[PDB]
């Protein structure tokens, strides 16, 4: 298999405008939403048909209960951070946990938090410690690191449980997640040369420009963008020298296949 990942995000907001949830939690496998929960529905629900198909009602009922607890825990934690920052008004609290199963069979795992969209605490599961970006985070680090069992529990979860869940979900969604749609690639002239790719899946793609066999620095890279049909598009551009021609060529790498478009 290519590389795959599983991640769960949480978002808490301290003084949300009317109608907006104070808590949201969404799971992803690769770029695909798989699960959602928020403080308005108070239910964990599938976000992919192959999740709904393969997880029985008892799974959604059990995690609904856990998510209601994690929601309350998130509120208490955000309340503590904002009191220690001495901040008024509405602020945000975020969490991300997950793992990657790499093509070569090795794994990674990560757990981190953010306040107002900036890194706050970052777990290191190898040193079993928390990195704190300021002294509010440092206070939390001290409290969390005093409970060494909970650090060991997160290491087990990232290294063993997370990977097992990812493998399970990869099988459920295999017709979506393990497929390949190669890119359609062309060079447009606009003076700049545009390498344009579309219709590809998965979204990971490498595009660059070479000049006379040396990589151009002077490349403008476009974002990988969703087309809306489950495939993606992207572009990369290079500016032409008006005084001297050059051998330009686009290079595209996607899911193990390399492609070259030489501009005549």
């Amino acid at each position, epitope marked *: 298999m290519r590389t795959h990942s599983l991640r769960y995000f949480r978002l808490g907001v301290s003084d949300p405008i009317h109608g907006v949830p104070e808590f949201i939690s969404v799971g992803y496998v690769d770029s695909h939403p798989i699960t959602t929960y928020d403080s308005v529905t108070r239910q964990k629900e599938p976000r992919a048909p192959w999740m709904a198909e393969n997880l029985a009602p008892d799974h959604w009922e*059990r995690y609904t209960q*856990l998510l*209601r607890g994690w*929601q*309350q825990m998130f509120k208490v934690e955000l309340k503590r951070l904002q009191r220690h920052y001495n901040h008024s008004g509405s602020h945000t609290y975020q969490r991300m946990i997950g793992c990657e199963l790499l093509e070569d069979g090795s794994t990674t795992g990560f757990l981190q938090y953010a306040y107002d969209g900036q890194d706050f605490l970052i777990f290191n599961k190898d040193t079993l410690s928390w990195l704190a970006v300021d002294n509010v985070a440092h206070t939390i680090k001290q409290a969390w690191e005093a409970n060494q069992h*909970e650090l060991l*529990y997160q*290491k087990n979860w990232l290294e063993e449980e997370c990977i*097992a869940w990812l493998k399970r979900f990869l099988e459920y969604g295999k017709d979506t997640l393990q497929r390949t749609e190669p890119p359609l690639v062309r060079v447009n002239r606009k003076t700049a040369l545009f390498c344009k790719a579309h219709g590809f899946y998965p979204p990971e793609i490498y595009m660059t420009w070479m000049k006379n066999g040396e990589e151009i620095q002077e490349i403008d890279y476009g974002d990988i963008l969703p087309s809306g049909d489950g495939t993606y598009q992207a572009w990369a551009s290079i500016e032409l020298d008006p005084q001297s021609s050059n051998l330009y060529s686009c290079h595209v790498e996607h899911s193990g296949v390399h492609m070259v478009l030489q501009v005549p």
Partner: antibody
Framework: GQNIDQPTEMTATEGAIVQINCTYQ??????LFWYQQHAGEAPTFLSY??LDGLEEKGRFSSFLSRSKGYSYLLLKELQMKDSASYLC??????????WGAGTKLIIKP | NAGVTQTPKFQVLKTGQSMTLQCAQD?????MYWYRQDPGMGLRLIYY???????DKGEVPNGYNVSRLNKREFSLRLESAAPSQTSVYFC??????????????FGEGSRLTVLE
């Protein structure tokens, strides 16, 4: 089906050592607990393991092997007050606690 | 520092009678549980409450129901007592649910005997 197994009863001599085994077959693993329950009383927390290896707490140590699915609770320098039941419990992938039926430990003075 | 406080300690019931067991914890915990303990088997969860304001069935909910009255208190009801409900009932609490290493704190137990 998920299963936790431990012996019904063990008998050892005052002053000696006893190893109480717990083997589990669970859907996922989020930690293993030992509780002590004296006769007629409530279970109280003894130990928690989730990575591999041995952890010491005074006269009691607890060991875990995740790949072999077992734990033991090691009691050294046994005293009459160690007479009790010892309950092991495992958290599965959905964080549900699965409880063993308990091992009653009898100490010979 | 009372910990977990449950009542009654002992109770005799006739088949068909209803009864409520009370449990309070003063540890500012969020999760509460009702277990029954029977000879020869591991503790079985009847109902639990992951946080104030929510509850759900455990492994053996039939014949029982619960109310999480507030953050401190978690009541267990026997709708219509049956001899199979003769058991020792334990209330327990923990700081959270769905964390890893957090242990349970148990009440003293409630011994109930149901007779025809």
């Amino acid at each position: 089906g998920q299963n936790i197994d431990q012996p019904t009863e063990m008998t050892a001599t005052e002053g000696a050592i006893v190893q109480i085994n717990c083997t589990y077959q669970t859907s996922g693993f989020n930690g293993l607990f030992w509780y002590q329950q004296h006769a007629g009383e409530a279970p109280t927390f003894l130990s928690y393991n989730v990575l591999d290896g041995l952890e010491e707490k005074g006269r009691f140590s607890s060991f875990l092997s995740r790949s072999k699915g077992y734990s033991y609770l090691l009691l050294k320098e046994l005293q009459m007050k160690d007479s009790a039941s010892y309950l092991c419990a495992v958290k599965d992938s959905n964080y549900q606690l699965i409880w063993g039926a308990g091992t009653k430990l009898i100490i010979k003075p | 520092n009372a910990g977990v406080t449950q009542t009654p300690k002992f109770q005799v019931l006739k088949t068909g009678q209803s009864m409520t067991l009370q449990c309070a914890q003063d540890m500012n915990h969020n999760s509460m549980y009702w277990y029954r303990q029977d000879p020869g088997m591991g503790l079985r969860l009847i109902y639990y409450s992951a946080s104030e304001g929510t509850t759900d069935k455990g492994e053996v909910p039939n014949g029982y129901n619960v109310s999480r009255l507030n953050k401190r208190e978690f009541s267990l009801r026997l709708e219509s007592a049956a001899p199979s409900q003769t058991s020792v009932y334990f209330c327990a609490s923990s700081v959270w649910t769905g964390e890893g290493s957090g242990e349970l704190f148990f009440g003293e137990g409630s011994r109930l005997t149901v007779l025809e």
